[PDB]
Design a protein around this ligand. Structure first.
Ligand SMILES: CC[C@H]1OC(=O)[C@H](C)[C@@H](O[C@H]2C[C@@](C)(OC)[C@@H](O)[C@H](C)O2)[C@H](C)[C@@H](O[C@@H]2O[C@H](C)C[C@H](N(C)C)[C@H]2O)[C@](C)(O)C[C@@H](C)C(=O)[C@H](C)[C@@H](O)[C@]1(C)O
Ligand SMILES: Nc1nc2c(ncn2[C@@H]2O[C@H](COP(=O)(O)OP(=O)(O)CP(=O)(O)O)[C@@H](O)[C@H]2O)c(=O)[nH]1
Lengths: 79, 136, 426, 23
RNA sequence: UUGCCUCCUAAAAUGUAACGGAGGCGCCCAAAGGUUCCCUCAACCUGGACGGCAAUCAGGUGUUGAGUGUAAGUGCACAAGGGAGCUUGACUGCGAGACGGACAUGUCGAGCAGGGACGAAAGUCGGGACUAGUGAUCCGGCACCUCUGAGUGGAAGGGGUGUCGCUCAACGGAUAAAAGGUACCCCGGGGAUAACAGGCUGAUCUUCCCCAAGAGUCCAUAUCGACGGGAUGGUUUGGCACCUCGAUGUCGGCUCGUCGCAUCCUGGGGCUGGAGCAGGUCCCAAGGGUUGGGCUGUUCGCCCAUUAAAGCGGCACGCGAGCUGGGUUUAGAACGUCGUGAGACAGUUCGGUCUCUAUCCGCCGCGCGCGUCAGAAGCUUGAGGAAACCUGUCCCUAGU
RNA sequence: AAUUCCUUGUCGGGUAAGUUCCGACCUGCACGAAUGGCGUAACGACUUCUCAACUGUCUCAACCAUAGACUCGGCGAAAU
RNA sequence: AAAACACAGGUCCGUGCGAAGUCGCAAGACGAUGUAUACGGACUGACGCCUGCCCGGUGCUGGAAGGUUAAGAGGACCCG
RNA sequence: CUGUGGGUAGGGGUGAAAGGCCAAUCAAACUCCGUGAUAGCUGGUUCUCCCCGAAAUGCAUUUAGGUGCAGCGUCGCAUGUUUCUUGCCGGAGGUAGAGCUACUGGAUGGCCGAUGGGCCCCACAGGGUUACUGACGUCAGCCAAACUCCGAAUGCCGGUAAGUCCAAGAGUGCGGCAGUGAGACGGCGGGGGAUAAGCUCCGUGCGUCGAGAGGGAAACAGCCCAGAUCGCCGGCUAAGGCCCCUAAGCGUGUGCUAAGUGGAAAAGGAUGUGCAGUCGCGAAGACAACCAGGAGGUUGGCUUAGAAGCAGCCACCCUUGAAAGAGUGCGUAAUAGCUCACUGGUCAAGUGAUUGUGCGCCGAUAAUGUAGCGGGGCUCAAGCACACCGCCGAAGCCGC
RNA sequence: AGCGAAAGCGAGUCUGAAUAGGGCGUAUCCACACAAGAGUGUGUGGUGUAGUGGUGUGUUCUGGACCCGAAGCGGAGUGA
RNA sequence: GUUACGGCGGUCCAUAGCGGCAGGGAAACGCCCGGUCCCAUCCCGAACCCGGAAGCUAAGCCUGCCAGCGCCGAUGAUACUACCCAUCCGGGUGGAAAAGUAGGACACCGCCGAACAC
């Protein structure tokens, strides 16, 4: 016989790249996703391909605003 | 006989034969029931055989419920073939039975005849099963 | 069990010998076999050719003509009678690219569908082997479909290996030994019969066997006569094993009645092993009964069809024209009037009509008075004071009242041979 | 199948603890 | 089948194979992009004209159930879905800090001149809801450039910037340019990889069983037993590819065997649907026996004439350093078929080298040596083995 | 059929018993007219069947002699 | 060792004669000291009855008017 | 046919064509040279010891038994704890599980039974017995890798505190040199297969072998214990053992086991344990013996070959409760013969059925030879549980 | 002495109309300030940057390239 | 500082929602009367936008009470599971659901500005 299957795209290596509590520079990619599983939060921007990145530096913080998981950057005061 | 009118996926992984049944583990329709005690793929062939056994024993009268439904397809690659060249096409339909699942149920006046019919079904079945009752 | 998908269908009459009417009969017969396999007839065409085409069977032009209606119908059931050689099946499959039916495989797989007993299905599997072994290495879905019979030059020069025998001969030896074992497997039902073979037969239980064309009503007659519950359905081959039951007469001697598997015409001849169950019943029977339904197809062609095989088997077997009784029963509610011509062609009309009419007294007579016989006309005169002298006569044999108006008179009864030979003892 | 059956079942021993190479 | 995208496999990060289960893609966009501002979709009536299941715009009702340009998902009702106004953010030119990242491809673009509107102020945009819709380098095209210009002036040519040309789709792309046969074959390798045999599995096969609906004349279990279920054996076809390709000779017959019992002839049993004579069936039993021919190489199988019967299997489908070569499987040739041919056939046919002085074990016989507590000799017991074991007709008993 | 898978095609001959052989039918998977079609006397270490005779081919093997084998003396290898 | 090759016989094709064909770069040679009733090539294969249809594909043999069609001194124009 | 002398020579000769012959070689002779051809292939590669020590994976590949780079080794430098373990804390997830009336898909019954078919009044007016499809669905209880209202455990990312820290001989970076890129089995999670394979393909800060000796599994790379620096004729132990082979223990206590179970399996049956219930039993006589009981309309009708108690056919629902059922069992033409139940006394302790509750049982099966404890042997356990004591046991640990 | 593709400029240079930022360079390190906490920069001041020839060793390049081994290919000759 | 106040916001955005029973407009919020004007309908002054307070708390909004639908939801137990013991069976330690049950809940908090008070 012959199977009509056998194909698959290259895994795109999505998911969270910085988890809550990780301190990030201004511009780091916090999440990679195809929709908005996470929505951009404070000082977090959403890119063309729905990549969540840090608009400002500081620690990643996962929260929820109006029933939508959100990625926030909380500033880290310099000690 | 018992065949799904349509399955979303014709070729499925073998249902996992692990754990005790979480649902359908008690008589809920009839007076008596056949409870499984071992894991098995109860094929529709076996279900038909057991159901006919019960109905013919209990003769005229009584009611028989078949709780399980053989909705899981199991494939069989064509005879005398080498490993590979894709998955075989569905060949037989089974119901993933796990221990403690009540496969059949019976409501019949005579307890003697009911137990005999259920025992005959258990004989047609491919695993250990016991005649459980509703009365706990 | 080697089934096939039919649902919709269109028929064609090959008609390579005989009359258009006979070709239509054969077409409708195979369409009924198709229904038995499960289908729904739509319409049937006819053609008129000489010896089948050695390669295409139906020819290139008719193959394309039928491919046209095939592609119009969009199903795979187009029916055409006949026995197709492996080459003919190859050519037809290449032409049509779909599944066309042949009489032999249709009969064989309907036997598979209807089989319920171990012996029956073993016989049908033997027929499968007989039919398929020729369809090996050559036919459509063959073993050597450019994929089989690979093991060729395994010995260029020589070395440390080699299977030996010819590949095709070994591959055939597989099925040859399979069917050799299956033919060895032949079970003697004579051991089941012996309860009445030597005993009874000789002990007077005569043997009436109902044989006839399929759908005719053989099992229905068995049930009506013997109060049985035998399977009754319009489908072809409703009866699989030749069952039997009891049925008595005014002259007692329970006539062990036996039904059979019906005939149609030009049977495959490979499932003669399957039919041995009924062939043996005919050969060992002392009264054959043909059953003909009231409004049955054709005036008389099914009778010739059955009688062909009857004559062949019985003449090969023994010196016998076993009593045949072509009774015309089950005629009420036949919903037809053109039956006087058949009645004059053969005088009989004894309606049981699936018990609706129940006028089988004439039958119950014929069955019986044809070939019934014992040591009738024995005058067992006895004082009637001993009690022993009346023993066993009214129990084993069967009295007929006769002069026995009282006990002190001439007492006679039709008794078995063993019971009384000189036991009158005046 | 006696040979394989024995070779396999001799893993059920106190020393092997129910496991052997090649079953 | 080969590249790309989506899903599940994938074992809740990422990733993860199979000739695993499913599909899509080699596009569409001048609006389906940008931006401003508005709107929500399905499903039923109080009810409707031709009007129906479905049109209407019937909102009259009804809570985010449809729709996303397109596969799949992740998303989107806050809208990313539906409408309009303007417009061309593919900021094109320059580019943040950052990040996704075997080596060869992606996300924000915060800032800059110059824009787009809507507007009104604030405001947002580097084609698209997002991930596919593509092809390195080399070679050359074509435009522009304040670059070089083989003595100088230009020029040719080159360079830069921007772009273009590959179903290079075998999609990391041997060449710009390429199909077959080999049985006439050859060499380098491989038990990394098939054919025989061994091994594992036991689907298939083979022997049985388990319940007993039925068949057996009334009478599941005399004989059988479907629908289903459970295993044995490892003699079939297979699956795997584990030793062997610095060679394990391959069928059939012959010779010689040896073993198992799943017994083709003794024992009783029962049951017998055993009256008798004969049968069937299982139980026990492997002592011995179990053929001669015709057809075919033939294993088998059919047949012939017999017999108590002409048993089934294992032993490398036992046995070619024991034999034969009938077929199979080199080279010659012909036929049929396929091939525009060399050739091929999983078809037919005729013809076609069967090597080896036995070292070791093994086995059949035979010696020599030494033992058996002095050296000899006759006769010996028998631990232990080896051999053999077959059975048929006719008479009476009794025509009981 | 040196050609036919179905195929041991069907029928008749020949045998006691004929997957072989001969003659026909021929529904030629897949004969065919100068890679010639069909016949053909003669010819053939060709292939294939039949019969007579003949016989150790065989039933079923026995015996005899030579050459080895075996023993003795001399010379004296080999593959592995 | 044959059923294969050859064979005598056939048919087709080529060849006007230091022929065609072949060996040679060439000269030359063979063909042949021959002459189309001869040579070479192809196929078939005594002999007998015959070799039926087809020139569509591909070769070969002729050429029907066109169109396509390199190599040149046809050299406008254009460019340094 | 043959002698002698000649001619034709290698991509060539010769060939009544076999790819034949051309100096024992011919599908392109031979010799020399190019030349030490080239071979991703096979083989071989020679002294020692000290330290460390892999890989059999990813990607790509005219690639798949090769190679590049990465991964992993080593040696130098540089950083120095950044590594790793454990606790805590911040995280995202959609697996196991579960649920599905939370979606997308497969299922018991009443409800409307709406859209409908016959009956329907036969009218198309109008309405119901409406066993019928009985829908969307209403309401009651069940499955999915490509279902999710949910949802762990681990794992992973990050932070923090410690631990390890005369070391893991850690992590990272850059260099010199690599080898590896054929993996195997075992446990767990999975795909393909028949949820076979000692099968195949994956995952696994999983292990071991590979590359690992030593002890135990009998023998036995991958299983268990345990990682060999050397020497001891010392000791304690691990796994495993402890009757003799073979070193303690034919250990102690309480039980079970009757088959050699132990020392192979899917099973029908209960007669071994203990259970725990349960009718009647009490020595207010229970299961039992001896135990008069044998024609009530008793051939009861059914019906008739008799249908006698009795082929059969549902019945006989009754009493001085005497102990007898219009009588189920063997019969038997049919009666008859002789009894099942219960009884009437002696009745001289228990008597049956039950989930078998759970232990431990018994029914089973290849071919050289016991043969499925390693052997002898073991049930007077040397078998099996539960306890409890010792030791024997390695290259382990300790001692020197 | 680098940057760039050069007119080239030069501790700068290339890109860019755009002193807009980046690329690559200015050994390295230390102090001072100015700044910004976007991951540190800017200048200023200090010490002054280290190659290159032999040669050992390990890899490597071109050669036979650690050694052995084809079938075969070519040139020229030898053989009827 | 008090309100059956209006807005702007927060909640790991329903414990908040939906539905029901009753209540008020003081300033406000609204409905509401018109389209002359800015502005607007792919038609409509319905909406948007513009002027007024004629009328009304009937609606919207808000207050209290209903646990009816939805929402949350334990604790136990179980499933599952990391590691470990275990010769197939299982078990231990640590974590621990989903469902269901008890129940909770008819929201809570911050800022302004309103009317009155001060
Ligand atoms: C007389 C003298 C020759 O004898 C034979 O001809 C026998 C009769 C051959 O067998 C015959 C065998 C035969 C006849 O059988 C089919 C056929 O194969 C050919 C013709 O040779 C031999 C032994 C062949 O071997 C066999 O080779 C086979 C390929 C496989 C087999 N084994 C490895 C599996 C192996 O032994 C083989 C290769 O010639 C052996 C090689 C060493 C030789 O060439 C040697 C020199 C032989 O010529 C010889 C022994 O001297
Ligand atoms: N109307 C009618 N139908 C009849 C009559 N006889 C037979 N049939 C039909 O035949 C069917 C039964 O066939 P059957 O009696 O088995 O015939 P059969 O001879 O046994 C053929 P088979 O052996 O293959 O079953 C019934 O369905 C019945 O309708 C008749 O007299 N009248």
């Amino acid at each position: 016989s012959s199977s009509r299957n056998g194909r698959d795209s290259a895994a795109q290596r999505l998911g969270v790249k910085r988890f809550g509590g990780q301190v990030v520079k201004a511009g780091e990619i916090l999440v990679r996703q195809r929709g908005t599983h996470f929505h951009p939060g404070v000082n977090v921007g959403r890119g063309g391909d729905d990549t969540l990145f840090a608009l400002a530096p500081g620690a990643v913080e996962f929260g929820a605003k109006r029933g939508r998981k959100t990625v926030n950057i909380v500033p880290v005061a310099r000690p | 006989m018992l065949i799904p009118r349509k399955v979303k996926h014709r070729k499925q992984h073998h249902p996992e034969q692990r754990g005790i049944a979480s649902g359908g583990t008690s008589v809920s329709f009839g007076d008596y029931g056949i409870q499984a005690l071992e894991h098995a793929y109860i094929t529709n062939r076996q279900i038909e055989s057991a159901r006919i056994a019960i109905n013919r024993h209990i003769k005229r009268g009584g009611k028989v419920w078949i709780n399980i439904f053989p909705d899981r397809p199991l494939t069989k690659k064509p005879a005398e073939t080498r490993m590979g060249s894709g998955k075989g096409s569905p060949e037989w339909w089974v119901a993933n039975v796990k221990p403690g699942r009540v496969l059949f149920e019976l409501s019949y006046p005579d307890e003697k005849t009911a137990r005999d019919a259920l025992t005959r079904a258990i004989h047609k079945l491919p695993i250990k099963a016991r005649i459980v009752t509703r009365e706990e | 069990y080697r089934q096939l998908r039919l649902e919709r269908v269109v028929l064609v009459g090959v008609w390579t010998e005989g009359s258009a009417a006979d070709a239509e009969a054969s077409l409708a017969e195979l369409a009924a076999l198709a229904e038995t396999a499960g289908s729904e007839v739509l319409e049937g065409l006819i053609q008129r050719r000489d010896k089948p085409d050695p390669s295409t069977y139906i020819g290139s032009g008719k193959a394309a003509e039928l491919r046209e209606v095939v592609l119009a119908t969009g199903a795979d059931t187009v029916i055409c009678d006949g026995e197709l050689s492996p080459a003919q099946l190859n050519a037809l499959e290449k032409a049509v690219k779909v599944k066309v039916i042949d009489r032999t495989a249709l009969i064989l797989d309907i036997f598979a569908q209807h089989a319920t007993s171990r012996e029956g299905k073993a016989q049908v599997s033997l027929a499968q082997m007989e039919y398929m072994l020729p369809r090996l290495r050559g036919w459509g879905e063959s073993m050597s479909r450019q994929a089989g019979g690979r093991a060729g030059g395994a010995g260029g020069g020589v070395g440390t290996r080699g299977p030996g025998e010819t590949k095709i001969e070994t591959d055939r030896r597989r099925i040859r030994e399979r069917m050799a074992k299956l033919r060895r497997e032949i079970r003697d039902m004579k051991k089941i019969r012996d309860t009445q073979r030597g005993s009874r037969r000789r002990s007077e239980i005569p043997s009436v066997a109902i044989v006839g064309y399929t759908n005719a009503g053989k099992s229905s007659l068995l049930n009506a006569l013997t109060g049985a519950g035998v399977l009754v359905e319009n489908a072809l081959f409703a009866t699989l094993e030749p069952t039997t039951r009891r049925g008595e007469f005014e002259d007692g001697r329970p006539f062990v009645l036996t039904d059979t598997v019906g005939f149609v015409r030009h049977l495959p001849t490979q499932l003669v092993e399957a039919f041995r169950s009924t062939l043996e019943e005919v050969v060992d029977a002392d009264l054959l009964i043909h059953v003909v339904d009231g409004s049955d197809v054709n005036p008389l062609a099914q009778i010739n069809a059955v009688r062909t095989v009857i004559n062949e088997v019985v003449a090969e077997y023994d010196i016998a024209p076993p009593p045949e009784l072509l009774v015309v029963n089950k005629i009420d509610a036949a919903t037809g009037v053109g039956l006087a011509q058949l009645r004059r062609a053969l005088p009989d009309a004894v309606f049981v009509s699936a018990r609706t009419g129940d006028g089988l007294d004439k039958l119950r007579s014929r069955m019986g008075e044809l070939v019934e016989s014992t040591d009738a006309t024995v005058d067992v005169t006895i004082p009637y004071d001993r009690g022993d002298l009346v023993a066993r006569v009214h129990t084993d044999g069967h009295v007929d009242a006769t002069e026995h108006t009282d006990a002190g008179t001439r007492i006679k009864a039709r008794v078995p041979a063993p019971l009384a030979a000189t036991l009158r003892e005046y | 199948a006696k040979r394989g059956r024995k070779k396999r079942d001799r893993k059920h021993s106190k020393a092997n603890h129910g496991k052997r190479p090649n079953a």
